[PDB]
């Protein structure tokens, strides 16, 4: 037909090793993204998954034809026969394209030489999460890309006005986080090979405290109230109060240990370590208070009579004041 002769005439004397305007001007590349989904943001490896439809557009004066058809719409068969920019994601730990059932790529060449190249990617990008204020934290961690071999004087990238489009935002794999918005950025970075134009997309995420609540905040508080119930028990039943206190200590330790396996091996104190630490301290103080009570009923009874009645009102007020100050101080930040 006519498309066969056009495609055969475009590829004669064509060199896919040389970018368009190899010694004239840098190539301008317009980039678009479509985030299909932002996958699970696991903090252990400090990474997150994302699925995008990456679209690039540029001008190639060698792929210019005169015909009655305006656009050649092609498969991935001709992607490896023309010049394709070497875009790579700078903060990706692992990234792969899609090849089932046929390489998920698209090439469209226009009447004036404008090439549009789209492909589907799944990226496992990297972002250091400052995991203070956990689990009441908010992050904004990027997806950056640039050319690998062509510096600023050879390839220039540029967003469009309708650059990044998210999908439905409800079919996404964000369990513990919530998408709030995005913003694009362009910059130039100095590298050992040259100056490169780098483009960034920052996704803003906020952690919803709905899993950590029913996992740790409710049970640890319940175990604290469990340690509280020892004060209303008679002061003569010594094995009862000792066993209650020390088994409550057991429950606190087990819950603390099983609760710390969500977050990574960070060395600073979070807003979750402080809570379970203070709960352990409270249980420790209740047991040591009963210990001093049992010593003081034998040493001098005038001091140990009204100590338990004081504890019955001092422990819940201290814990409630701690909760108020903690929650306001960590929700103001």
């Amino acid at each position: 037909g006519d498309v066969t002769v056009i495609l055969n005439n475009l590829l004669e004397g064509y060199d896919n090793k040389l970018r368009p305007d190899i010694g004239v001007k840098p190539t301008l590349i317009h980039t678009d993204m479509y985030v299909n989904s932002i996958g699970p943001v696991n903090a252990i490896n400090m990474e997150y998954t994302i699925d995008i439809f990456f679209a690039q557009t540029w001008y190639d004066r060698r792929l210019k034809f005169n015909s009655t058809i305006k656009v050649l719409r092609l498969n991935s068969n001709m992607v490896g026969k023309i010049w394709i920019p070497d875009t790579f994601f700078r903060n990706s730990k692992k990234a792969d394209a899609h090849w089932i059932t046929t390489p998920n790529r698209m090439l469209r060449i226009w009447n004036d030489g404008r090439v549009l190249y789209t492909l589907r990617l799944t990226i496992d990008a990297e972002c250091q999460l400052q995991l203070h204020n956990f689990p009441m934290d908010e992050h904004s961690c990027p997806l950056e890309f640039s050319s690998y071999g062509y510096p600023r004087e050879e390839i220039v990238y540029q967003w469009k006005r309708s650059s990044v489009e998210v999908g439905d935002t409800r079919s996404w794999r964000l369990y513990q986080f919530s998408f709030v918005g995005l913003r694009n950025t362009t910059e130039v970075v100095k590298t050992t090979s040259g100056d490169y134009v780098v483009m960034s997309v920052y996704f803003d995420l906020s952690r919803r405290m709905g899993y950590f609540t029913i996992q740790t905040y409710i049970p640890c508080t319940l175990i604290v109230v469990l340690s509280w119930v020892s004060f209303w028990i008679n002061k003569d039943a010594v094995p009862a109060r000792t066993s209650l206190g020390i088994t409550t200590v057991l429950t606190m330790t087990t819950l603390s240990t099983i609760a710390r396996k969500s977050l990574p091996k960070v060395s600073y104190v979070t807003a979750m370590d402080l809570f379970v630490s203070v709960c352990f301290i409270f249980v420790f103080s209740a047991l040591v208070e009963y210990g001093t009570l049992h010593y003081f009923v034998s040493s001098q009874p005038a001091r140990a009579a009204k100590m338990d009645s004081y504890a019955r009102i001092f422990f819940p007020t201290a814990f409630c004041l701690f909760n108020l100050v903690y929650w306001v101080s960590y929700l103001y930040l």
């Binding site: 990456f54 875009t87 990234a95 990617l121 690998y148 090979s193």
Partner: peptide, 12 residues
């Protein structure tokens, strides 16, 4: 070697 969108290598 990383391979998105092409093989991540440079030749100059």
């Amino acid at each position: 070697v990383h391979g998105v969108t092409v093989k991540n290598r440079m030749i100059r």
